[PDB]
Amino acid sequence: MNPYERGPNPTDALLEARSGPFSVSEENVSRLSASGFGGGTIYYPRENNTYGAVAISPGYTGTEASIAWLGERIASHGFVVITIDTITTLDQPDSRAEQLNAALNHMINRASSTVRSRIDSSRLAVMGHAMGGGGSLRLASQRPDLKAAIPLTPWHLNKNWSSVTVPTLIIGADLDTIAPVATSAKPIYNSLPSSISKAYLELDGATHFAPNIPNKIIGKYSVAWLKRFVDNDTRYTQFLCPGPRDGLFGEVEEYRSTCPF
After folding, report:
1. Which of 7, 15, 46, 134 is deepest in the core (most CB within 10 A)?
2. CB contact set of 126 (below 8 Å; sequence gap of 6+)
3. Is 46 exposed, middle or buried (0-12, 13-18, 19+ CB in 10 A)?
4. Using CA atoms, how far apart are residues 231 and 45, in angstroms rounded to an integer?
5. Helices 68-75 and 216-230 meet at what angle, rounded to 10?
6. Which residues, other chains included, contact 78 with Cβ-Cβ below 8 Å and sequence gap of 6+?
7. Between the CA of residue 24 and those of 27, 130, 152, what are the distances in Å?
8. CA distance 56 to 194
9. Are residues 190 and 257 in contact, defined by beta-carbon separation less than 8 angstroms?
10. Which candidate, 107, 81, 96, places its Cα nearest to that of 129?
């Protein structure tokens, strides 16, 4: 009934594991094979199907290494993910939004036949850490044809993103001092239209750099979000709605959404 559904029926354990159910391979993208971004790496399911595609930017001073685990982990759940370097490491969010776009177009039009044939180019999503997350918001603002956006501990000069209609999961870190949620993640989140699918997830005991190491909360709810909105996969709705618990036994500091989806 839903032709975009991929992989087995999800469970907490399956979404929390270090790798998802899809066996993945890599395609190196060097700086000078890449037009409009700094190169990177494509992770793609070996299983010959079509999948949605994700571009992931790092933040200020950061490299591909800072986000690599997340691209691989997400690809292992049924997506073609590019994890990029930026033209320079000090690039600002709007240029990073352009690079996420250049990275999406590389995967669709420029990569090998192996990668291009595995992409449903109509079902695309962007993610970014920090300034990379502001990049995600800007491109989402400019490309309402995108299916999902996941800004991680995001920063942008502008926090008013009421122009975004792309389903957005804002992830914050409670101990973040580089992009405090008081001044960034939360103002950003509340700006997004109450009429779109959106969620706000704040990690507990998390610094700005929590997204830069394997984190099973980030991995779980990123995959759940991309599944629901890139694949329209309603098997994943129950993970987002009502969504993660706070408190002593729960897995998060705070969670808000526009559930039900």
Report:
1. 134
2. 54, 55, 56, 57, 100, 104, 135, 136, 139, 140, 146, 148, 149, 150
3. exposed
4. 15
5. 50
6. 6, 7, 20, 21, 22, 45, 51, 52, 227, 231
7. 10, 26, 23
8. 25
9. no
10. 96
Q: Which domain holds residue 246?
A: 1-261
Question: What resolution, expressed in A, was reported for this entry?
Answer: 2.2
> Residue 196 corresponds to which tokens in the numbers above?
């779109």
- Total domains present in the chain: 1
H or E stretch including 41?
strand 40-45
Residue indicated by tokens 């101990």: 175
Q: Structure tokens of 119?
A: 């992409």
Structure tokens of 123? 């079902």
Q: Can you tell me the distance from the alpha carbon of 254 to that of 246, in angstroms, rounded to the nearest whole number? A: 6
Per the structure block, which two tokens stand in for 65?
């290494």
Q: Using DSSP, state whether 232 is helix, strand or coil.
A: coil
What is the C-alpha separation between 75 and 26, in angstroms, rounded?
A: 10
User: CA 54, CA 213: separation in Å to the nearest integer?
Assistant: 19
* Nearest alpha carbon to residue 75 among 55, 59, 57: 55
**Cβ atoms < 10 Å from Cβ of 30:** 10
